[PDB]
Design a protein around this ligand. Sequence first.
Ligand SMILES: *[C@@H]1O[C@H](CO)[C@@H](O)[C@H](O)[C@H]1NC(C)=O
Ligand SMILES: *[C@@H]1O[C@H](CO)[C@@H](O)[C@H](O)[C@H]1NC(C)=O
Lengths: 511, 511
Amino acid sequence: DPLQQTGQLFGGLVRDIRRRYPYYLSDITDAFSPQVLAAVIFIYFAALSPAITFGGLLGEKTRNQMGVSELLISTAVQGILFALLGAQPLLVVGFSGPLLVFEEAFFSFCETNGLEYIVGRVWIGFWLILLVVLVVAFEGSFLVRFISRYTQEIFSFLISLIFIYETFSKLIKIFQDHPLQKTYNYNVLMVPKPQGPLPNTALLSLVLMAGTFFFAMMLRKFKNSSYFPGKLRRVIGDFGVPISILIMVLVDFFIQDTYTQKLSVPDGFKVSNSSARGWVIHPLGLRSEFPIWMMFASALPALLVFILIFLESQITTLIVSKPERKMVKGSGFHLDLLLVVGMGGVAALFGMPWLSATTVRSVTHANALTVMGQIQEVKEQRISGLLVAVLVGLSILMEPILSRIPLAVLFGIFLYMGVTSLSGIQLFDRILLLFKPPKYHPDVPYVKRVKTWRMHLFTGIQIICLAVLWVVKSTPASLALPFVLILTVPLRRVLLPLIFRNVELQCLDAD
Amino acid sequence: DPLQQTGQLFGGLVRDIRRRYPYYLSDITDAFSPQVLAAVIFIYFAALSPAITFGGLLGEKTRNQMGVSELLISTAVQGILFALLGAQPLLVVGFSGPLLVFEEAFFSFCETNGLEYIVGRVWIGFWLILLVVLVVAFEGSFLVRFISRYTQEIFSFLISLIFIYETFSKLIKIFQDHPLQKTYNYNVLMVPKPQGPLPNTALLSLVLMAGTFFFAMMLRKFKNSSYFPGKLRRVIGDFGVPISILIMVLVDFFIQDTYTQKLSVPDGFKVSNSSARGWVIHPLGLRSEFPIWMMFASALPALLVFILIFLESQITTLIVSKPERKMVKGSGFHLDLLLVVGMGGVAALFGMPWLSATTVRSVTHANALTVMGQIQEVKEQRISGLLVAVLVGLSILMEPILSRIPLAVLFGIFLYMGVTSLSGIQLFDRILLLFKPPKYHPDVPYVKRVKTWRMHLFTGIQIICLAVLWVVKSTPASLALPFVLILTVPLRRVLLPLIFRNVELQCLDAD
Ligand SMILES: *[C@@H]1O[C@H](CO)[C@@H](O)[C@H](O)[C@H]1NC(C)=O
Ligand SMILES: *[C@@H]1O[C@H](CO)[C@@H](O)[C@H](O)[C@H]1NC(C)=O
């Protein structure tokens, strides 16, 4: 019903508003639960740490044009606004890898042509605002109807694998920075960072990450396990991630001689490069007048950004708001798209980065708010997102608290997040079934109705698509990764029916 | 009933021989299976490493009169003989902690008096031979019929807890030897051992132990899991411990710079202190004449040693040969005791330690040879024990391979061994049930036929007994630890019926 084309202009937006806004008092009053607070802390850490990392990276690639502080402010403000007004408050808006790739590419292009980067970002944001207004006007979001379970599952599996690979690559980098050596230099300098290898740092980081992951898994099992009174067991289980974070933070705190990398938040809310840019960015130019040719040619990068943000946000909303996840309040596609893209453009006007609804963190938020009885229900409320965004904004004032948080603890939390995000995806189920004998296959329609080798061939085609997407991402043509993902949609609709019969597709791919 | 008293002298011995010896060809031919080889490797490592540790300890306490070479030779010879002739080949003989404490105490007493310690040992061995001959003549082993599930369970739980605590204490020791410090000395000497703290050694040892335990658990779960073809999955499951050992050994091998403690085996078969003692020890004395007062007073410490060895070996045989473990070939309670004590006394003649049937290693051997369908059957054969003893004897010739083996890998293997030995003990099941709500209690007679609080009180009484045994063991009066264990037998027979009704005891304690 929400994904339907109507003759009235902006019909999807008003339909989404009329569907969601009646439940506003229900969302406000539904946050009174310990599970909500536990998910608040979990999502706060899982949104601050990637935000810190992406801000540091963005400050590194650019000449500090956009760094940690601007990313934090943008994330906080956009999260507050999206939680307050969005049709699906369970979504969390944050910076993503493809966005960083585009930002570095645009900065390189601007340096090559000598134009101002941030003013180009402002004009791209204006183009994005125009594009999203037109798309919502013409009900373009209905196109996500053609995104079936095939594309959603491929995207979710690839993105979770990317999260796991990023965590493991960070661990490998922390090992390479401090190699296991017989001897090390003494009285090293750590003012910006350790200039040389350090003893016990890599092994302690690995130990902390593994311990955090193990404790998260143990608490997740204990939540379903029947070793304690039901109320106490559920309260401890839903607080599992904060418990693991607290335990590992205390463990690292009680170690005084060894050095482990901690979260670094800036002192005060200010621009990363005060001399380079101000709070408000002039659309005509801070130093040189903006040529009209870029004013009119910003559409193509803006078109690419809109395609990336729209595809990622809408596929993430489709994944989160599936009927199998027991979401009864409904979700709005047009309103969410308008909000995310328009606020991204407005943030680009203020010099802050634009953001899209990330997949791993939104799925993790939904899973944390999911109440298990089989999924009995999902706590859908805006207070969780509002509090997460408020805490992200206030993370600057909480420097003593975040200074004690090791990065390896968050690496373990990210590994756990990716692994549990892998759960619930039938593509992962077929991956597991690839190794099981045909006797042990579960009683599901896509096992009885279809032969085992046909289902294995379907899973092999999905694996081939995943490998192609991974190769594209590793290729410096990473911005084309969404587009080839779009190429998955015709494959299901055109090429797949040539191979598999109608009943095989309807059983294997179904809403 | 094999465990009964008959009119004929040496009745138990002849009954056990006439029972077990017919199946000799069956034991010889029953070893043709990959599970047998995997258990051979597992038990070989799990018997060599404790033997090496105990030999090093014995060299430390004594003036190298008793060392690791004598311990290895005695263990190998006695294992070969027991596997060839014993009525329960699945039993593995080895040194134990109580034996260490007695040897240290006897050496201290002999030094304080001033006579030769090893000649006292050989006289103790002669007294042991006389005592075991008399006991088997009078069929004293039937007294273990008084030992019920109560005492066996308490002993097994305490011994498994002791194994786990020893592994964790070893980990704490290797952490304390190399503290996590900001700086370390350089050009450290490691000719006998590291003379100072070393970087990354403690953390790498912890990582190796945790990884070995994790891999062992993952392969143990995979053995019963539904993945992979059944034959291949089972074959990998039996070889789980060797696979974990190999993986961790390779991981440590590929780390050149960092130092981890390895197994240390002697070069050649020779006495630890050539000047102090020879291979054959003269019963009247090597340098100082042996007074007759010790000649006739050696019985009391020899009686203590016989009580310790007999009690440990018989309870271990009771635990291993329980009917619920599906052992159909039979067991020997009189031939096994005679063999163990007689070869212990003969080893005392040849200047080698006496060895008892260790609990954790025998239970581990039985579990490794156990075929799981519920326990379908147990592979009972002599070739496993014979090969384990032969490899222990040949450990000297395999110096490079063992030098490549780290000690943290074996610590993780010991942790896995203790945890797996904890399984199958109903006392541990009631410990787990202490936390579960009454609804989730399993379907066993001691849940319905007895109230929840009565069963909890029974488990609390067993907990108090365990605490008393632990306190006694930590107390320097460790030699009394078996004796107070015997005190559990009257408590079940006399004090317990005062509190619990007959039906409660018959349900909670049953064979
Ligand atoms: C800040 O911007 C200037 C140009 O105004 C640039 O040269 C400088 O490198 C930037 N700061 C840092 C720390 O990179
Ligand atoms: C061997 O015995 C002698 C007796 O004089 C003693 O001093 C020495 O410590 C012992 N150990 C070694 C390794 O020589």
